[PDB]
């Protein structure tokens, strides 16, 4: 319990969770037949995969993979 | 063409990936009006959603800001 959200610091993180955070609400309109609604989430969605990469390419070679 | 994955490392990251790229499908037939479609797409935003948080404040421990 605690709706304050943290402020979008120079982070991956702290934007691929603003990201996600978004697409969550464009879900009603995009299933309500909204095509602003669907381009919102699937402009977010990839972006997101985006973050999700340059953490990836990062965490691997950080971890053992 | 990048629809080769890496093998996923044991981390949330990697599960992450998993998540949003599908999500990227689950537009389309949650854009048709499919009921299961649309908690799929949720399911899976609140769940990509949690894996952020956990590596934000973890994050948040590593790195000051």
Do not use: D, F, Q
């Amino acid at each position: 319990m605690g709706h304050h959200h943290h402020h979008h610091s120079h982070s991956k993180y702290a934007e691929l969770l603003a990201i996600i955070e978004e697409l969550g609400k464009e879900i009603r309109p995009t299933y309500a037949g909204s095509k602003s609604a669907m381009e919102r989430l699937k402009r977010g969605i990839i972006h997101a995969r985006g973050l999700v990469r340059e953490c990836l390419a990062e965490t691997e070679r950080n971890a053992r993979s």
